[PDB]
Amino acid sequence: SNTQAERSIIGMIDMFHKYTRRDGKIDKPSLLTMMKENFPNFLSACDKKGTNYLADVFEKKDKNEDKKIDFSEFLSLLGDIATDYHKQSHGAAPCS
Amino acid sequence: SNTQAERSIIGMIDMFHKYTRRDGKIDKPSLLTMMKENFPNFLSACDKKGTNYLADVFEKKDKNEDKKIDFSEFLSLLGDIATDYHKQSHGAAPCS
Ligand SMILES: [Ca+2]
Ligand SMILES: [Ca+2]
Ligand SMILES: [Cl-]
Ligand SMILES: [Cl-]
Ligand SMILES: [Zn+2]
Ligand SMILES: [Zn+2]
């Protein structure tokens, strides 16, 4: 029986696999769809602050500039999102 | 209403906060406890392969050698765990 933490991690792999193309990477329109579908409250908190997270997320996370997001770059994105939530838990405003 | 993905991320912050000391970092015995409590099936799969993940995890993840695991180093650990699960989902053996 997996724990909540283990299920969470497995769920992130399964989420990545909803959006990959045949080359095992996520293209730009698919990454935006993934964000809208899985992080809509995160995105809404950004909006309220005047920030359109989807304007630049692909360009910021496509570190090797191959116009795809691979699993390592996907993990980096999740780490950015987690870092925002962590800042919020310390009293920061969202999407700072 | 948060989504499953957003709840997962928030859950990782709350998990980090179960184990921090006053300086907002996780010390070595606490990190091992966190692993045993939250990733026991992950650890058991390692064992079966002949790998004791807890022998070196602290030393591998304490990148700045301050004898604490801060949030950024905690995210790196989660990314290692996710990368293992991702490899498994592609047919690799666990804890490779
Ligand atoms: Ca890329
Ligand atoms: Ca450290
Ligand atoms: Cl893939
Ligand atoms: Cl903290
Ligand atoms: Zn994959
Ligand atoms: Zn904290």
Numbering used by the authors:
A (entry chain A), B (entry chain A): 1 to 96
Paper passage:
To confirm that the substitution of Asp24 with a glycine was solely responsible for the unique zinc-binding site observed in S100A15, we generated the D24G variant of S100A7. S100A7D24G eluted as a dimer from the SEC, and crystallized with one monomer in the asymmetric unit of the tetragonal cell. Diffraction data was collected to a resolution of 1.6 Å and the structure solved by molecular replacement. The S100A7D24G and S100A15 structures aligned closely with an r.m.s.d of 0.719 Å over 96 Cα atoms. Subtle adjustments were observed in the orientation of the histidine ligands, due to differential packing of surface loops between the monoclinic and tetragonal crystal forms. To validate the modeling of zinc at the dimer interface, we calculated an anomalous difference map using data collected at the zinc edge of 1.2482 nm. A large anomalous difference peak (>12 σ) was observed where the zinc had been modeled confirming the identity of the bound metal as zinc. While crystallization of S100A15 was completed in the presence of zinc, S100A7D24G was crystallized in the absence of zinc, and yet zinc binding was observed in the same geometry. These observations indicate that the zinc-binding observed in the S100A15 is not an artifact. Similar to S100A15, a chloride ion was modeled as the exogenous fourth ligand to complete the distorted tetrahedral geometry.
S100 proteins are a family of small, EF-hand containing calcium-binding signaling proteins that are implicated in many cancers. Hallmarks of the S100 protein family include their small size (~ 100 aa) and the presence of a canonical (calmodulin-like) EF-hand motif and a non-canonical (S100-specific) EF-hand motif. While most S100 proteins share moderate sequence identity, S100A7 and S100A15 are 93% identical in sequence yet intriguingly display divergent functions. Intriguingly, however, S100A7 and S100A15 serve distinct roles in inflammatory skin disease; S100A7 signals through the receptor for advanced glycation products (RAGE) in a zinc-dependent manner, while S100A15 signals through a yet unidentified G-protein coupled receptor in a zinc-independent manner.
